[PDB]
Each structure stands twice: as structure tokens, then as C-alpha cells.
Amino acid sequence: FSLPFKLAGLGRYVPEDIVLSSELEKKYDLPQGWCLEKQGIRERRWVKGETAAFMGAEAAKEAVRDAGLQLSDIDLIISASGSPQQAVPDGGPLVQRELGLGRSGTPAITVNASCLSFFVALEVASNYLNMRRYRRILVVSADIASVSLDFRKPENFTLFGDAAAAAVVTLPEPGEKSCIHASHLRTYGFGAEFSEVRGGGSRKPPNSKDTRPEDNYLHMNGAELLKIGFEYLPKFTESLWKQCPDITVRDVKYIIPHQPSRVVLDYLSLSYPEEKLIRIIERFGNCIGASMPMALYEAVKLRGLQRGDKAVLTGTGSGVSFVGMVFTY
Template sequence: MFKVKIAGMGKAVGSLKVKSEELEEQMNVTSGWIVKATGIDSRHYVNFENGENALTLGIKAAKQAIKNSGIDPKQIDCIIGANGSPLQAIPCGASLFQRELGLGDSGIPCFDVDTTCYSFGLALFVAANLIHNQVYNRILIISSDAPSPTLPKTSNEVRALFGDGAAAAIVTKSEKDEKSALHHYQNANLRIGSRFNLRL
């Protein structure tokens, strides 16, 4: 058990809202198929004309998480990028987030955990380990993806599911009188899935 807590969270989505009815027309499928198959009424896409992308969404979510945590950004001592797909190969996406947050010269360690849909969960487990072992005290995790430009080339099932969005969390140590902890993690070699029990 790791005595950690999520001190603050943030989120952001693309500014273009696309209803399932619109997408069904583009995909040339039966009206009502998307909602029936997925339960999704609408999704958000980034607006590239306004400069939106996975990086800007991640920064927006991160700033919310930092504000909600009540800490000074300079108190962050590690940044983990946890994207479904890498923003770029070298340097890691986390270093891009670091720069855009105005922490480019801070020396804060940055690295990515890129394991597709498992990225955030695995990053949380890694962060909990690092905090539990007193390597770091306040870790910022940013998970941001904007796959919309590639979706028209995918299958209808995939296109119906995905949108563009980001989430971020500040992970810190729990105080002695707080119950929050990461109680369980099950990897199963990422073939079956990961399971977490984080009580807040």
C-alpha cells in the first residue's frame, strides 16, 4: 500500500463539439447507430485553426490541476507524460509540458509512460512508488491525446469512440490522518488490464 493522494485534478477538451448525428452522416451509417453501439452522444475535437493540439490541451489541464492542488508550480519536482500516443520521440512529451508551464529551466526530471490506454494508470502507479520511496514529493501527471486528424482513416468502430482531451493530476504523499492510498495494482503484463483501488 502506498500512502499517496491526488491533491488536484484538471481536464480539457477540444473546442469543436461533434454530435453523433453529424458523425453518422460523415460515416454514412444508420442514424442512431453510434449512440446505440457506444452510448456516446457527442465528442470534442481540437481546432487546429485556433492553435489547439494535444500539447495545449495538456497544459490547460495541468494548470487546472496545479490551481486545484493549491501548490506553487515551482514545488513540482517531477513531471510524467502519460499519453495514449507519444507527442514526439525525442525529447519526451513531458519535457514539452515542462517548457510550456514555464519550468523549462527548473531542472525538474521529466519522462513519459506511453502504454496506450494504460498510460495514466501506470503513471499513477509509478508516481506512487516514487513518492512512497521519498524520491519525489509532488508529481504532476499529464495525459493528453488528440487523435481526431487520423480518425477518418480508421474503422467506424474506432472513429465513433475517440475524441480529443486531456487530464492532469498532482500526486503527493498522504498525511498520517488521511485515508487516501493506492491499495492495489494488478498489471497482468498489460494483456488483460490494470486495476487500481485509490481511495480519496
């Protein structure tokens, strides 16, 4: 069985300011080439005043044009960023307002699976489409990580960049092969503490003096995160590909990963031909929720993924969750 599903248009926004790793290396006394070797990052983009809703709206406008549509044709907006612009309201109504659709009534909501929100939003969208509830759905991921960096830790502040990307999804028309062949999501909440920001909510509120600045930074336990993979990834991979026994990785053109560090790409490059891998981290850094849809944009707009080609979206994110999808574009 395959599920009809079309990525009808794609869009991106990247901030103008290119922050070279060499520049970060001089200012914070790191060795020349440290970022490239340790993080796999030559450069990243950082905002200089724009909001996350602004970035998302710019990406969305490109996606809507790319799909041959007007903004008034969109009948549902799903905001799918890795981090919020602000606490209230959610990213949905904020990007709806930014797009000039603030009086349209067009439903605008958020789907949140931390840095894997884009994937889960596509899934939610695919069900709305196949239930015929909505017809033309905007999915928008925009993240600004540069304002939350921990400059105590080079592993942190050299890692993150800012970006947005977006997709419009529809049901395919007759003669279009666009579809999902397999999809899988697993969550291992025992890993929550191994990639966590304790602040940003009711647990450690910003105005509470019981809160400490460090609560507002990301803490990771790399060793323990990797163990979740050692324990559960082979099973995850098997369950996914189980779903489409007539399709193997040999049949797909591109593997399109969420890429929060060089480790995922290094692992994939040991396993799969390099030509199949979509790389964006070296130029955009870890852009949280925007990483996977930026890689998708790259695959289509820079690397020639064509309609009828097969590809795989895949990723691991805070939670800890695993996602994968095998699809015909």
C-alpha cells in the first residue's frame, strides 16, 4: 500500500549574514579549522533582526509560488519549527499574520516534535489530505538558534545556525506518482534528559529567581544519546523498510537526513554511497527544526531530485525520537 501525497512546492529563507567558522575561531581562541574538523561546519547564517515568523513567511511565499498557488489557496497552515518564537500565541497564527492572511480565517496550528517537527507535520498533513478535510496545506519550519547559544561551550556555539524552509502539500493529480511507501516514528522518552532545555516553561520559568541562566541552554549527553541508537536503531530501520518490501535503499536516489551534527552524515557515509546523501550542515550548521526541510529543498532545487524518483527522509531528535519515510517525489 502507498499513500497519495505530493510535495507540491518548496521554499527556503536563509539570513544574509554568512558567519565563517574561521571568524568564530579567531574571536573565541579556537584553532584554525577546528569547526570544519570537529563539527563539519565551514559556515552558517545568523539573523540580524528578523523574526522567526518573518523567516517562515518568506519560505512559505516561495513554496506557495512554487506550487502554482496564491496565498488565498492555502486552507491549513502547520507551523513546525524546532523552537518557538515566543510563548503565546503559537507559530501558526504568527506566520499566518506575517503572510497577510491574518483576517482570512485559514486555520493555523503547530505540530511539535522538537527538531523533528517538520516530519511529524508532514504526517499530520498527509492524514488531513487523505481524509479530504483540507486540500492545500502549508508546512513551515523556521528556527533562530543563534540567540540562545552557550558561549561557554564551543561544541554548542559553533554548532547552530538560523534558517527556515517550507512545503506546500496536496493530493497528487492523475498521472502523478507522488506517494508515501513507508513511514515510522518511535519515541524513547527515557532519553529526555540526554538532550534537554530545562527552562522555557512552567518547570523553570524565565522570571523565577529559582531559575538559573544555565537552565535556558541546551544540555546534551552524547554518550547516552548514542546508546539509544545502539539499542533501538536497527529495529527502527527494519520496521520501516518492512513496510515496503519491493523497495530497498538501492532503489532510492537520495537520503535526506535531519543533520544536527556531522555524526549522522558520517554514519550514513559509511553505509551508503556518497552521491545519495544530501548535505547542508557544512553551510548552514544545525538549524534545528529547519534542518530536514532545508535538506529537502536542497535535494529538489540544487541536486535534481525529480518527480518519480524515490527518496528517504530520516532523523533523530530530542525526546528521543526516530523518524523515517520512504516516498516517491
